[PDB]
Subunit: 67 residues, 2 copies
Amino acid sequence: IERVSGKPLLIGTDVSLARLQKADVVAQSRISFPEKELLLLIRNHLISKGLGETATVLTKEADLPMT
Amino acid sequence: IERVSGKPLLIGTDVSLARLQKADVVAQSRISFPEKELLLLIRNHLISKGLGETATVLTKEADLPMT
């Protein structure tokens, strides 16, 4: 099944063949993302876990849309 | 197949039945994690993405094992 399809490196998963060339595209895609969506996730984690005395410090490095 | 097994809420995935009670355990498990492994992942991301002038600021909130 590996030979007549897109050659996975002997990983045993999703042995159907229509589900094997789905795994050709989803794996080799080029995912990129903006950094701004992640920096708000950092600040939303610090305030919730007790140590929120650097949320005001993060005004300097980048923007602060929410308080 | 839903009725003789652990009743997923009509989500069409992994239609084999041995692969259906694997999904009973992996989903309903109680995953917990220490916060310390995540706070080093925050600091290792800030230094790499150009804005590393709060890595020394993170000495105050928690420990700084690596520079």
